[PDB]
Amino acid sequence: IESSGIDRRKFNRSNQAKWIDKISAWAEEETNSYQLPESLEKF
């Protein structure tokens, strides 16, 4: 846990859990950008 990393990441993981329902969509969630190793290491 970093100072830039807020404790509301479980809400983003719950939003990503509701995203995996069907593959008919085309646009992914913005919160996947929270799960990047280039962004998590800098935070």
Partner DNA sequence: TTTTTTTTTTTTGAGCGACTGCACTACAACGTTGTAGTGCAGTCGCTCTTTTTTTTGCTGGTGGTTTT
The answer to whether 1 contacts DNA (rule: CB under 7 A) is yes
Which member of 21, 31, 36, 40 binds DNA (CB under 7 A)?
A: 31
To which residue do tokens 């969630």 refer?
A: 29
Q: What HEC string does the chain produce? A: CCCCCCCCHHHHHHHHHHHECECCCCCCCHHHHHHCHHHHHHC
The answer to whether 40 contacts DNA (rule: CB under 7 A) is no
The answer to whether 10 contacts DNA (rule: CB under 7 A) is no
Q: How far is the CB of 21 from DNA (least distance, A)?
A: 20
Residue 43: what residue type? F
Binding residues vs DNA (CB under 7 A): 1-4, 6-8, 12, 30-31, 43
